[PDB]
Design a protein around this nucleic acid. Structure first.
Lengths: 93, 276, 96, 104, 78, 92, 106, 82, 98
DNA sequence: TCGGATGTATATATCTGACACGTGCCTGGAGACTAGGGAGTAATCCCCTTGGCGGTTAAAACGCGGGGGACAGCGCGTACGTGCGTTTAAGCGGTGCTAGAGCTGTCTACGACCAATTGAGCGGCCTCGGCACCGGGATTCTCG
DNA sequence: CGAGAATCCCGGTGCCGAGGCCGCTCAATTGGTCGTAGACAGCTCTAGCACCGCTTAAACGCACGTACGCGCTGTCCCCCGCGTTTTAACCGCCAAGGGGATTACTCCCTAGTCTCCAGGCACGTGTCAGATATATCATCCGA
């Protein structure tokens, strides 16, 4: 029927960061699998964090802590900084 | 390695000022060279006459950078009929030549796109892209036959007005003309056969090597550097590009330059100053 | 006229490193996969992408094992790779 | 209007939120969690794609293939930690010959 | 016995990409056992997934799940 | 905060297997953690199976497949046999 | 009515009801089948019986009646299939299995 | 009160006893200095996760449960604590 | 007067400390080490005794496993003396440093 | 020291099939409004961690043979790579042909859910027996 | 081979925790309803399997030289075993305070429901990046 994929969004990101580079279909499938796997990892860690504290919500606190736990040092710091900027940007409006 | 070309001498032995500046450059793909903004360099050099070799471009494909410069407005182009993408020469001039012709005798049947002849008031200019002997010397015998044909052709021309021959003559005449002489024992550009051809060219026409005339003992002065192994970075090169002159023009000779710093090809420009 | 033993072997290592090919004949691998899977369940149908995925995983695992074992053999002051080195690498990786 | 545009992202927020509930991770999902996670995901591939093509542009090509992603990930020092266990289909291998093997 | 299908040159070439200059005469016979064991390990889980799904076609994604359970995550097929 | 650990059940199983053998508190803690970890593994694999096959419930077949995936060798064969026997007795 | 627990009904010893409650509260799926807790409890009690039997054999070998973590650690390591099920697990205060490489011994 | 030069507290005989339990017969002198770094790295990796876990719950005491989960993150799965 | 040969005591000890199941590391130095490591992340923490014991036990298990693996590596190289490069090999093959 | 065998940087001429872009439409996302249950805040108390003092001594630190093992060096002979003719099976191109994968249409059984209820299970308290240990003697290894 | 050191065994002692007991739970069980989901039947198109023929890249058996794996020897150096001197760990003891569970209350954030529309996914299509293919030294081996 329909396929749910991140092809469009990864293409948009590639255009934003590299305005003159194309991406083949295979590298597209790899970038989809990467996004799906990272989503699974972080969401599972957030769910486990919520379970441990006898809490029944996945909010920004659980996500940030899971991101800090999974990603290594510089990636963790940059990712949490960018995520906090985005969420403050969203809640402002 | 390194070499620094000495300053431009702009007066003749008898003290007459240079009135004519000729630049010759094997651009090894005219289009690419223009994107390598080789025309910006030409504008800075402001020659009266510009001779180009290995344009690899038929006249219909010339970049609109053609019109960009008003001063060089008289332009003549040649490309091979059956080897598009190879050879190709051009001659661009501030003043209009009296006569222009192409090839060395039978271009109308063997359109090779290697040679342009232009006659001016006081001299005849020939620019050439001499055929390479080829990797493994596969076309050395052709080159030898071509050298003979060319010599005979030029003999005729020089019989009238003085001759200036410029371009890529695809030989390093003597050991001083390349970095690795024995390293190029039988290699294209330094076979005994090609070197002898150059010597016969000087003796038969006759012609003088302008640069070596002025700088007879100067080593490490090259005009071509192999793209591979960053030989340009190391100055591992050869002198393949020349201005050869009739003996009668030597009193008019001010300088013969090698423009080592000008990028955009695996050859650099060479420039001649004459007091006419 | 034969190139010396070091020169041709490393000529091969450099080519086989940059290539990202499959390096294993596909039909023999497909037959091997069918024969092994014949045991667990009878009359199975393998999708082609499944065989390709198995081949990709097999190549990756074998290449990793061969790297880890080259390190093991090199440490023993020897360049020839021996089966003892593979066995040692497998036991250390906790896969035995 | 769209939540992704409101928060200034490129990855979808509605799709991530739908996944966050449908995946049965918790009984309730906060409002800021999808935005935070979409931002993290966008940053991650922004990084992978930024590396991957340099690693493509150095080889005179303009198209990213699995080989360039394998090179970009392996050449990095913490992305390799993140993706140590994963294998990329026909990703080849980093060129690494051990010293003894090179005859001195 | 198609483990004989994994020929000596193919094993040698896998070693070359792994970065091995000299290969003894017993690896060819020894690595086939490792390869066979490795496949058995992934083929069992793939067939179990397919059997549970009540299908009879081992799809590529099932193989992907089978690799993922053992840690050998694979990208490109889903 | 009652903790509801698997102490009584594990003690009953020992008494069943060995009638005259005791068990210390540290061993009780080891058995509690073992049981919790195995339960978590089986439940996680069952949920993953349900999600993979677009299902929405955990029937006994998902548990059977999860057991077959986790337990290696004969352990799987005897675990599934005793589990299906227990289910069969329960239904009737 | 008369009350009979599913743990007794199925003939097991682990509590089916507690497993059922953990399965729902654990957020593994929104629906839980009827037989899933029974099957899971049967598997759990089987595995516990096996490891306890091996531990008791090891303890009786050492002329000790009580089971301490050392006995559980020898029972786990000496068997082969239990060992790969619990390959990446360490037992607190469990010690290590006594094997010394024969090269080291003259 | 801040603490300094504590990695040397893991004395040489302790390393010797650990190596003996591992089953080695003869130890070179440059092993002690290698293991005091290896164990430092391992402890740093575990403590980072434990402190992250305790900080998320807005606590101030590293409960044994936090260390157990930090270990389970790296695939060690300690048994006997909680 | 009577002195044992260079390997006997070494082997008596493998056996005793492979038979017993104590901690093998003094508690206070390890506790101070753990506190020092944890002070670089969050200031003024308050560890529990059970947490320190768990860290101790995990460290002993990890170090014993590493020593067993590097002993195998050293024996493979036709040697009995354990050397640091063997430890580096064991760590590399597992894939921890790299 | 030299003659022959491999990397090898730019530039242009075709083929192609595979990325990149119109497009349309429908399905999932977006906006509004409500209920209510989860979570944050506030106060408390008690128990669990920190710190500090002193005594005891097991364990760590240090020094000194010396002997066994790490390591450098020589030799040898057998296993492996290297090239080459030959055979063999893998691609690759149809070609067909049917198992069955994937989707859709009922609806019946099956599990979520709520009102009682009671008994399996948990917390606090004995209490006697398993077990570590010291005291001593007999047994086994070990190296000169 | 035998004196000496390490180890196992035989047993009384006392200790503390494993196991049983009793009171009090609170959640597991019965008995009903009711919405829905996945069991089951049925249908269509897809792709997986079997076959055949041709090309030729590759696998194979074979010689041959050589280089490196392993064995042996000698040397020296450095780690172990033991004895002597610290010294800091360990046990017990105390006080103290702070923070981690608890209960109560409130409030506000999200699930749910409904309606409306736009963006993104499948589908077609024109264009051109990549794959060759042809021209135009320098350096590193074996001798």
């Amino acid at each position: 029927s329909r396929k749910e994929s991140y092809s469009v969004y990864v293409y948009k990101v590639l255009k934003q960061v590299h305005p003159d580079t194309g991406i083949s279909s295979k590298a597209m499938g790899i970038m989809n699998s990467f996004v799906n796997d990272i989503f699974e990892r972080i969401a599972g860690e957030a769910s486990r964090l919520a379970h441990y504290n006898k809490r029944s919500t996945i909010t920004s606190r659980e996500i940030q802590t899971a991101v800090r736990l999974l990603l290594p040092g510089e990636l963790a710091k940059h990712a949490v900084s960018e995520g906090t900027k985005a969420v403050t940007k969203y809640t402002s409006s | 390695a390194l070499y620094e070309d000495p300053p431009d001498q702009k007066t003749s032995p008898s003290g007459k000022p240079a009135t004519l500046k000729i630049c010759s450059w094997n651009v090894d793909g005219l289009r690419a060279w223009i994107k390598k903004k080789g025309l910006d360099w030409v504008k800075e050099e402001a020659p009266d006459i510009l001779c180009l070799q290995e344009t690899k471009c038929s006249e219909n494909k010339l970049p609109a950078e053609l019109q960009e410069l008003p001063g060089l407005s008289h332009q003549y182009w040649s490309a091979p009929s059956d080897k598009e993408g190879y050879s190709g020469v051009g001659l661009l001039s501030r003043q209009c030549p009296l006569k222009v012709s192409y090839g060395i005798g039978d271009e109308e049947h063997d359109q090779e796109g290697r040679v342009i002849v232009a006659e001016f008031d006081s001299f005849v200019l020939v620019t050439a892209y001499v055929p390479n002997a080829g990797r493994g010397l596969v076309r050395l015998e052709y080159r030898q036959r071509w050298d003979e044909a060319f010599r005979k052709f030029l003999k005729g021309l020089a019989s009238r007005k003085p001759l200036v021959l410029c371009g890529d003559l695809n030989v390093a005449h003597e050991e001083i003309d390349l970095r690795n002489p024995k390293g190029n024992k039988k290699n294209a550009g330094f076979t005994p056969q090609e070197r002898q051809g150059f010597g016969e060219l000087l003796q038969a026409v006759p012609l003088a090597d302008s640069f070596r005339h002025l700088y007879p003992n100067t080593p490490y002065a090259y005009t071509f550097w192999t793209y591979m192994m960053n030989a340009r970075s190391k100055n591992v090169g050869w002198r393949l590009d020349y201005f050869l002159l009739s003996h009668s023009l030597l009193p008019a000779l001010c300088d013969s330059k090698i423009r080592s710093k000008a990028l955009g090809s695996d050859h650099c420009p060479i420039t001649l100053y004459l007091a006419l | 006229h034969r190139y010396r033993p070091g020169t041709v072997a490393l000529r091969e290592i450099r080519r086989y490193q940059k290539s990202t090919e499959l390096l294993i004949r596909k039909l023999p691998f497909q037959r091997l996969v069918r024969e092994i899977a014949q045991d667990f369940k009878t009359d199975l149908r393998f999708q082609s992408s499944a065989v390709m995925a198995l081949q990709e995983a097999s190549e990756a695992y074998l290449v990793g094992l061969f790297e880890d074992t080259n390190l093991a053999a090199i440490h023993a002051k020897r360049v020839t790779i021996m089966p003892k080195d593979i066995q040692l690498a497998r036991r250390i990786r906790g896969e035995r | 209007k769209t939540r992704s545009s409101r928060a200034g992202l490129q990855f979808p927020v509605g799709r991530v939120h739908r996944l966050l509930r449908k995946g049965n991770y918790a009984e309730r999902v906060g409002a800021g969690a999808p935005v935070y996670l979409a931002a993290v995901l966008e940053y991650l591939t922004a990084e992978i794609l930024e590396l991957a093509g340099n690693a493509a542009r150095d080889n005179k090509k303009t198209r990213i293939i699995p080989r360039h992603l394998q090179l970009a990930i392996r050449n990095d020092e913490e992305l390799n930690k993140l993706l140590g266990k994963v294998t990329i289909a026909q990703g080849g291998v980093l060129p690494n010959i051990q010293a003894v093997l090179l005859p001195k | 016995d198609n483990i004989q299908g994994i020929t000596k040159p193919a094993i040698r070439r896998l070693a070359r990409r792994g970065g091995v200059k000299r290969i003894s005469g017993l690896i060819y016979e020894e690595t086939r056992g490792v390869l066979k064991v490795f496949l058995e390990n992934v083929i069992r889980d793939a067939v179990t997934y397919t059997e549970h799904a009540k299908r009879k076609t081992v799809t590529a994604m099932d193989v992907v799940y089978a690799l993922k359970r053992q840690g050998r995550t694979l990208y490109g097929f889903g």
